[PDB]
Amino acid sequence: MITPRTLHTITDDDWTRIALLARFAFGDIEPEQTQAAWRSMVPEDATVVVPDETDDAFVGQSLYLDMQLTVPGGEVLPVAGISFVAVAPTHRRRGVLRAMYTELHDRIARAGYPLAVLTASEGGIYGRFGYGVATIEQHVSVDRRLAQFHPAAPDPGGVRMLVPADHRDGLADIYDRWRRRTPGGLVRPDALWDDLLADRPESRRGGGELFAFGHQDGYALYRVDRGPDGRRSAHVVELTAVTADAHAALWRALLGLDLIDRVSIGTHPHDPLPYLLTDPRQAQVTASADDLWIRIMNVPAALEARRYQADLDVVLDVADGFRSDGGRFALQISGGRARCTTTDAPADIEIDLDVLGGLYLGAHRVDGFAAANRLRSKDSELLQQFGAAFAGDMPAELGYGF
Amino acid sequence: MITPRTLHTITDDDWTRIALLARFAFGDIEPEQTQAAWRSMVPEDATVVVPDETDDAFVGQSLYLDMQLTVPGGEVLPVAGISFVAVAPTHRRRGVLRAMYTELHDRIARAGYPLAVLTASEGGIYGRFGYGVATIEQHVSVDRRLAQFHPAAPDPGGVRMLVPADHRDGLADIYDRWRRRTPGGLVRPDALWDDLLADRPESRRGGGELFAFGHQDGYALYRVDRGPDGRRSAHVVELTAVTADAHAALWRALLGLDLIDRVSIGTHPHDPLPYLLTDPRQAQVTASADDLWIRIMNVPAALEARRYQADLDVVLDVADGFRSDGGRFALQISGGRARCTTTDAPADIEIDLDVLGGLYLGAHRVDGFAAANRLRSKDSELLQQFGAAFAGDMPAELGYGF
Amino acid sequence: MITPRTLHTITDDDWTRIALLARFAFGDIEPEQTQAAWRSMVPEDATVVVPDETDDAFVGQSLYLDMQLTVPGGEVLPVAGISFVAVAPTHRRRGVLRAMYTELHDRIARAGYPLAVLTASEGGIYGRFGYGVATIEQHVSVDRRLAQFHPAAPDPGGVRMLVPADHRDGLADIYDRWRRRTPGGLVRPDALWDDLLADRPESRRGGGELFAFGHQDGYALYRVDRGPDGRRSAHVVELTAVTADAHAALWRALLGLDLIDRVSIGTHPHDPLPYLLTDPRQAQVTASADDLWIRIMNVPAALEARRYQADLDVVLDVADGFRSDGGRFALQISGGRARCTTTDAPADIEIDLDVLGGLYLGAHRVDGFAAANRLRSKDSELLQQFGAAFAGDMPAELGYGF
Amino acid sequence: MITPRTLHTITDDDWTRIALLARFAFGDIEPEQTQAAWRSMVPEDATVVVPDETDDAFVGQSLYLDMQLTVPGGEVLPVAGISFVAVAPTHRRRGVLRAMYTELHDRIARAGYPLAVLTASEGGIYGRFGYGVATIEQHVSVDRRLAQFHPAAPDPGGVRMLVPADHRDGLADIYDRWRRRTPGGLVRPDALWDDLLADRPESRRGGGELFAFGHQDGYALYRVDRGPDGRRSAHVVELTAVTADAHAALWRALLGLDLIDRVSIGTHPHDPLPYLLTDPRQAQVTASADDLWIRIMNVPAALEARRYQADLDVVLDVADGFRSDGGRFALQISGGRARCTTTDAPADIEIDLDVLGGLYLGAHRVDGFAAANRLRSKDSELLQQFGAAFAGDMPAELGYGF
Ligand SMILES: CC(C)(COP(=O)(O)OP(=O)(O)OC[C@H]1O[C@@H](n2cnc3c(N)ncnc32)[C@H](O)[C@@H]1OP(=O)(O)O)[C@@H](O)C(=O)NCCC(=O)NCCS
Ligand SMILES: CC(C)(COP(=O)(O)OP(=O)(O)OC[C@H]1O[C@@H](n2cnc3c(N)ncnc32)[C@H](O)[C@@H]1OP(=O)(O)O)[C@@H](O)C(=O)NCCC(=O)NCCS
Ligand SMILES: CC(C)(COP(=O)(O)OP(=O)(O)OC[C@H]1O[C@@H](n2cnc3c(N)ncnc32)[C@H](O)[C@@H]1OP(=O)(O)O)[C@@H](O)C(=O)NCCC(=O)NCCS
Ligand SMILES: CC(C)(COP(=O)(O)OP(=O)(O)OC[C@H]1O[C@@H](n2cnc3c(N)ncnc32)[C@H](O)[C@@H]1OP(=O)(O)O)[C@@H](O)C(=O)NCCC(=O)NCCS
């Protein structure tokens, strides 16, 4: 049988067991300083585990991080960031995750979070729990030997070569300004900043010691990697720009790396980069995947918190097959502001809870989910209004991975 | 030393010259019947050529095809499909294309086409001539051994295994119905259908003989090829679905190909495929690039022909650095329909002509162009409205390559 | 409602349907003349099909070939060679195969075949139907620049360079002699020889026209190709050797091919080749897989037909989860000769029907099957004796693929 | 020169010389702690060297380890494990190995070892010295995303996730149980366990730090590595299972590693793994090579120490082209026990000494050696009897590399 236990706080011996299970279940684990940084974000009663039959090792674990997320319009919501989820390879597919998630989401609801959020190791896990893909990350690789900037593109200058660690406060404030105006922005505590700028050798998936370009309103952190042959590439770890000027200035700097063949980055689908070039094909998309996932815990609170770009007057029937967070709601939007209240009236639109989360930061169209029968309406004209309302003011992008 | 001449009709001897230049300039050329099918679509006075010093050969050529394009909301416009553009590698970068395009577009304008359209061999060529990227093709590969359908995805059945050459009329009608509903749709004449279905071994890149799945409301044409090892993959040449049911049923058939490891397709960004699966990541994007380019020749006609997703009342200053097809226009969109009138009033929004063409089928947000200074307004609220209006209710996809 | 239909005889029209379905199901199909050669081996009432709702096409098919298989000891048994098995991708995993196979095996049993045999497109299909892997094919690649023959190894001479198509009868007779002495040998009809020696381009696999080395007591057919780049490679299509002298002579000729880098072949696990070399590592196994599968239809007939390598006296309980061809059998083996009679007596050894087929040509140890609980006995030393008895005195190898 | 000498003991000064030559001759060398552990198993008078001109360095070396090998039937024999064999690249192919081997084997014989054993850097070296390939290692790679366990396969549970360095004694205990039951088993002293469990970075071969699955009756040690693509793979360093249940349970744990694509291991040809799966092809063999080589030093003692699977009464003439350890022997085997006595009687079977060693742990058939004239008889049925007798009841596997 499966009986999860909610740990009031995590003792050192608990973390040792959490690290061991995670390293086995995932196949590797981040360095100790990174683990400690994440652990420091877990609030009370936010760790759910399943002990082995002698109450020694954990065979299942899950926890959440106390976080703050920017939504469309600029409102910042407290959200529970699910993390360190793992079930021992010896105990998988027996309902351990489901048991753990049932308790964990009770804890999250009890604590008042209007949203839970996560990034997923695999794409087929969390839909069934009501999580929708809220942002998309695309891998873009730029051939900097061929790329040229469009004659109209800004060339504002003002970029400096920086030792990142010497500018912790400056970089953190640029990120904060970006965070406040970008849906998907997350508050990034000091511990995370310190770990990033520590730049530990283990931390390197693009090879080599951190470089940084700095601008008044943006920065880019990157690493250079050498091929067997001897061909250099740059991997942008993070590029955060508050203004279009900064974004362009930083890209001009990056594409100015003379002995570098290609520059790559994980970015959002509407990155201005290719529009800045004379030939947009030089900014090559090589992959695209889900990034931030969102489960709406409290539909009225979530829907009223964000802003919209079209008016709407509908009754939504939100289907929740995991918890009871769905039901029928009157959704009335005017002036880009929504009122969303429980109702008994017949629904105009039926929508799966995960779909509602997926649309929440403005990342998808309704017609794809509609084709899949996960969103439905007798009135296809209404569906379009709905999709148009949920569109975003600013392209969404997850501030950092967790 | 460059003087284009316009061919009133294309003689067999003229075409022999055109084929020769095309083959040299491109490095290869389609089969005879294929060429003949395209030639059959060229109207009067629609070919511009530049001969060599002794009028033995052409060292420059360009022509257009008489075509019909579906725009957002369903109006079908006559359009000039530019094709077989080539300048001898011995005469390149001397202004030969520029000279030819100048004359060709004069002809297009005199013939009354509101749009010119093309597909580009490279991405850095046509922006300067006012062409914007109007649709996007993404290469998607599905690991069919791992993909599973979402519990809600339609499973209507009704798919037959077809000899495609035996159902020319049925396939053509399905295509026609898709065409009428989908921006980017192009009328496809009998000659093209015949050539497609002839399935000639040279135009047979990426597999063996065609297979076809047929549904009342859709079809998929595909080929299978072998790895050196002996592993098989399927490449969908064309999948055309009038309804969501047909699209789903066809994908279920393709993903049921037992001995095939992967199924790939060149599709559009908003293909419902990933929404049909339990794990959307299994629909893997491996490339994304420009497909259809559009130059608006007649701003009022083009803007009034399409429907819009939001209402607007602005003055638009359209910059044309190639011809005189821009200027200031009052654009008033009301109930999703536009009146567009030349005016002297000051502008609210400045936009490069190519950008207007690129937005024309709903394929982009405004942010990229704006950041690049290719679309300009002192009111950023206004630009977002403008982008919202130009969105489409149906995802755009070019009917076929030309 | 799956109602299989048995074809009393195959009409040209039926075959047209069979070829269409096979091509869709497999991803392609062998040449018409090859199909015809297989078709010539199908006896009456040996084809079972399932029509589509329209009764136009088949959505399922299966058939068997009338064949003759050599078993350990030299006895030659009539066997039904299952082939052309396919279910339409639109109709799979609905029990169509099971329904067809149920009828087809009823037909096979009524025709009196003691064994049914097949080669499998995938390894997870036929176990559940009682088929065991009876031979193993290993891909072996020899670096002929480095390989050197052991000082003791035969160097008989006697090999000629042949135009194989000019030597059909001589080749055929060498194969026949090999067939009579090798378990797994299949009678190979003139139609198959003719098709092989026709060497139709379609089936070459990128390799060139056939070469053949000829010996009094053996032959090798091989092709050469040069993939990237200019480097040549030889793939042996078939090496059939009646004597050890011929085997060695043929290999010395193959490894004498001066401009060839590597010689490869699909052979059996106990091929003498590496034992002929000073460094056995130069004969590199790169792959290993099931080749021939056998389902014993008549346990007494099958077991009494073959000879055994040790004496035994046991009761077998053979489990058949598909038909009723198992039961308890008294197996008395004396002088390498078996009497197998059904009994009510309690069993010493319990074995799955597929396992019994798998052991039938001497290909496995009992250990793996026992660990997997597919073969069971309290007296573990009795299992070893069972294994010893079922060993062969000549390594088994499938005569040809089908 | 060549004038070898035997070190009575190895001084730190000598060992430094041995490590210098080894590094040069091999192109690299294990860490100091690893060397020390091997050095600790070298008994008296067990190192043969050839000094350079000045006697300040060696230009040739060879030594043996005092070891204990399990043979079929379970007797454990003292054996001499040859290691650190090296000749300076400046002194090679002048007969220095041969000269050293002559003295070393005199020492081995004088010390009383009935067998000498080694693993080979290349496959063509040691057969000439009377060493036969006694065990085979195959690299198997499992696609764990597709692999599924057969419905009959044991599912015993009981597997724990261990920090292997915290369970040295428990792991050693399990290995000792396995090695006593498995021909090829080798006593593994504490020094080797310590070195293995110290898991030094330079020994990890790209993979990360060790994982261990532990069971009451088995363990698996493995590492995980990433690719450029960020995909993970697991390589099993060692899987040691006393029972069938333990073996199945460990593989179930391994194939349960959710984020790993493939799990690989170097195992023996008769590993039960593919028999545990529904599709045996998912356990893909990708390589196969010699592992343990054996030279029989004392034919009567070696042949009498092991047990046999069948009875036999023949005279062997053993050909030894390197020493004089061959001759004619009366081999009488009854009740699986052999008496082997030197004799003048004429032989029924002639066998090269290396072949006798190759057959000694049950790994081969006679067919190959016979075809190569390395094993000879007029009575071909007597050869099969000889082969059946030398078969093993437990599949042989080398305990560890040395
Ligand atoms: C992912 C995870 C914890 C699953 O735990 P689990 O206990 O096996 O899951 P459950 O048994 O509760 O499964 C619940 C349901 O989700 C499904 N599911 C679980 N993991 C899945 C995966 N990786 N992909 C797809 N579906 C999955 C199950 O099939 C089941 O569906 P069903 O209800 O229709 O039967 C586990 O496999 C694991 O530890 N994996 C490694 C990845 C990881 O560490 N965690 C995720 C980081 S985001
Ligand atoms: C493409 C094409 C016909 C160009 O002809 P061309 O006569 O060299 O072009 P022009 O000299 O008139 O060039 C006009 C301008 O476009 C630019 N241009 C032309 N071809 C270009 C290309 N492939 N990429 C980028 N820019 C290009 C020139 O640099 C020039 O810029 P400028 O005005 O600032 O000087 C020619 O290169 C060709 O035939 N190549 C093969 C590709 C092809 O077959 N045609 C297009 C298939 S859609
Ligand atoms: C193999 C094929 C004919 C199966 O037909 P099907 O009608 O889908 O099979 P069924 O529905 O009767 O399946 C029966 C059982 O076999 C199982 N099976 C396992 N692996 C399988 C596989 N690759 N294909 C089909 N069934 C498989 C089914 O899951 C089912 O198991 P269950 O009873 O436990 O649920 C079909 O997949 C096909 O046409 N593939 C091309 C390859 C081929 O034809 N075989 C070559 C002959 S070797
Ligand atoms: C292996 C080793 C020490 C050879 O020393 P050597 O002094 O060159 O050998 P010899 O000259 O005494 O050669 C003896 C015989 O074996 C043969 N031989 C030696 N090395 C061989 C090899 N790598 N492959 C094939 N044959 C070889 C010789 O040709 C010679 O044959 P012959 O008697 O018929 O002429 C040496 O090559 C070396 O140091 N290699 C590096 C790794 C190593 O030693 N391996 C041991 C790991 S088990």
Tokens standing for C51?
A: 């029509």
- B343 Cβ contact list (under 8 Å, min separation 6): B315, B328, B329, B330
Residues of D in contact with C123 (CB under 8 A): 279-282
Ligand 2 cavity residues, CB under 6 Å: B 25-26, 85-87, 92-98, 120-122, 124-125, 128
Which protein residue's CA is at the shortest distance from atom 48 of ligand 3?
C120
Q: Answer whether D257 sits within 8 Å of A20, measured CB to CB.
A: no
D110 CB less than 6 Å from ligand 4? no
Specify the resolution in Å.
Answer: 2.0
**A·D CB contacts under 8 A:** 44
Contacts of B53 (CB under 8 A, 6+ apart): none
Ligand 3 centroid – CA C117 distance (Å)? 17
* DSSP string for residues in C102-134: HHHHHHHHHHT-SEEEE--SSTTSSGGGT-EE-
B93 is in an annotated binding site: yes
Q: Contact D246/D154 with Cβ under 8 angstroms?
A: no
C-alpha of residue D20 to centroid of ligand 4, in Å = 19
Q: List phi, psi (to 5°) of C19.
A: -70, -40
Chains A and D touch, using 3 or more CB pairs below 8 Å: yes
DSSP D276: G
Gap between the Cα atoms of D38 and B247, Å rounded = 66
All domains of chain B in start order, with CATH = 1-134+291-295 (3.40.630.30), 135-290 (3.40.630.30), 296-393 (3.30.1050.10)
CA distances from B18 to A122, B6, B12, B322, D22 (A): 52, 13, 10, 26, 70
Supply the residue whose CA is at minimum distance from atom 27 of ligand 2. Answer: B125
Instruction: Compute, in degrees rounded to 10, the torsion defined by CA atoms A22, A24, A26, A31.
Output: 60
Q: Would you say D63 and D83 are in contact if contact means Cβ atoms under 8 Å apart? A: yes
* Contacts with D286 (C-beta within 8 Å, 6 or more apart), sequence order: C286, C287, D139, D140, D141
Contacts of B199 (CB under 8 A, 6+ apart): B164, B165, B209, B210
CB atoms within 10 A of CB D188: 19
CA angle D343, D346, D347 (to 5 degrees): 90
Output the CA A96–ligand 3 centroid distance in Å: 32
Contacts of A52 in chain D (CB under 8 A): 160
Calculate the CA dihedral of residues B176, B179, B185, B190 and round it to 10 degrees: 0
Q: How far apart are CA A67 and CA A290, in angstroms?
A: 20
Is residue C385 a contact partner of residue C379, using CB atoms and an 8 Å limit? no
Could you tell me the end-to-end alpha-carbon distance of chain C, in angstroms, rounded to an integer?
Answer: 31
B-interface mutation test, from A271, A275, A375, most B Cβ less than 10 A away:
A275
Backbone angles phi, psi at A255, to 5 degrees: -80, 0
- The residue ranges of DSSP E strands in D244-343, in sequence order, are 260-267, 283-290, 292-296, 312-319, 327-334, 337-342
Residues D50 and D2 sit within 8 Å (Cβ to Cβ): yes
Ligand 1 centroid to A294 CA: how many Å? Answer: 17
Ligand 3 neighbour C97 (Cβ under 6 A): yes
Q: Is C90 in the pocket of ligand 3 (CB under 6 A)?
A: no
State CA C320 to chain mean position distance.
Answer: 22
Q: Which ligand is nearest to the CA of A24?
A: 1
CA distance to partner chain A, nearest, from residue B205 (Å): 22
Q: Which of B50, D73, B191 is nearest to C381 (CA)?
A: D73
Q: Checking DSSP bridges between strand B349-352 and strand B312-319, what pairing results, if any?
A: parallel
Which residue among C50, C125, C292 is best mutated to probe the pocket of ligand 3, counting the most ligand atoms within 8 A of its Cβ?
C125
Q: Is B94 annotated as a binding residue?
A: yes
Within 8 A of C365 by CB-CB distance, chain D residues are 270, 395
Distance, in Å, from the CA atom of B25 to the CA atom of B85, rounded to the nearest integer, reads 9
Which pairs with CB-CB distance under 8 Å and at least 24 residues apart come from D53-57?
D57/D17, D57/D20, D57/D21
Q: Residue B49 is inside which H or E element, if any?
A: strand B47-51
Peptide bond into D2 cis (omega under 30): yes
The answer to whether A233 is annotated as binding is: no
Select from C288, C353, C379, C384 the residue whose CB has the most chain D CBs within 10 Å, as the one to mutate to test that interface.
C288
Give the strand pairing for A293-296 and D292-296: unpaired
Nearest CA in chain A to B271: A368
**Alpha helix ranges (H) inside A1-118:** 12-26, 32-39, 96-111
Please give the number of the atom of ligand 2 that sits closest to the Cα of B85: 45
Looking at chain C, how many residues does it have? 402
E strands, A32-75, are 47-51, 58-70
What are the phi and psi torsion angles at D348 (to 5°)? -95, -25
- For residue A389, give how far its alpha carbon lies from the nearest alpha carbon of chain B (Å): 10
Dihedral-angle region of residue D96 (phi above 0 means left; psi in -120 to 50 means alpha; beta otherwise): alpha
Question: What number of C-beta contacts closer than 8 Å exist between A and B?
Answer: 134
Residue C125 Cα to ligand 3 middle (Å): 6
Residue C2 CB less than 6 A away from ligand 3 = no
Indicate which of B145, B155, B159, B161 best probes the interface with C, i.e. most C CBs within 10 Å of its own CB.
B161
Q: Two tokens at D369?
A: 């050696």
Testing ligand 1's pocket by substitution, the residue of A87, A100, A133 carrying the most ligand atoms inside 8 A of its CB is A87
Can you state the percent helix, strand and coil of chain A, rounding each to 5?
A: 30, 30, 40
- SS3 (DSSP) at B80: strand
Quote the ligand 2 centre to B291 CA distance (angstroms). Answer: 18
Residue D13 near ligand 4, beta carbon < 6 Å: no
Ligand positioned closest to the Cα atom of D87: 4
Coil, helix or strand at residue A14: helix
Q: D87 CA distance to ligand 4 centroid (A)?
A: 8
> Which residues in chain D are closer than 8 Å to A27, comparing Cβ atoms?
208, 224, 232, 234, 257, 259-260
Is B86 annotated to bind a ligand? Reply is yes
Nearest residue of A to residue B282 by CA position? A123
**Ligand positioned closest to the Cα atom of A402:** 1
Q: State whether B161 and C21 contact (CB < 8 Å).
A: yes
CA distance D129 to D369: 17
C284–D287 C-beta distance less than 8 A: yes
- Nearest residue in chain B measured CA to CA from A121: B281
Q: Binding residue per annotation — C175?
A: no
State yes or no: B17 annotated in a binding site. Answer: no
Question: Do at least 3 CB pairs under 8 Å connect A with C?
Answer: no
Ligand nearest to the CA of D145: 1
Q: Is the Cβ atom of A97 under 6 angstroms away from ligand 1? A: yes
How near does any CA of chain D get to the CA of A4, in Å? Answer: 19
CB contact under 8 A, C89 and B228: no
Active site residue C402: yes
Whole-number Å distance between alpha carbons of C126 and C132: 8
User: How large is the C-alpha radius of gyration of chain B?
Assistant: 22
Half-sphere exposure of D345 (CA within 13 A, CB side): 13
Cα–Cα dist A62/A106, whole Å: 13
* Cβ separation B123–A367 shorter than 8 A: no
Nearest to B233 by CA among B137, B149, B145, B138: B145
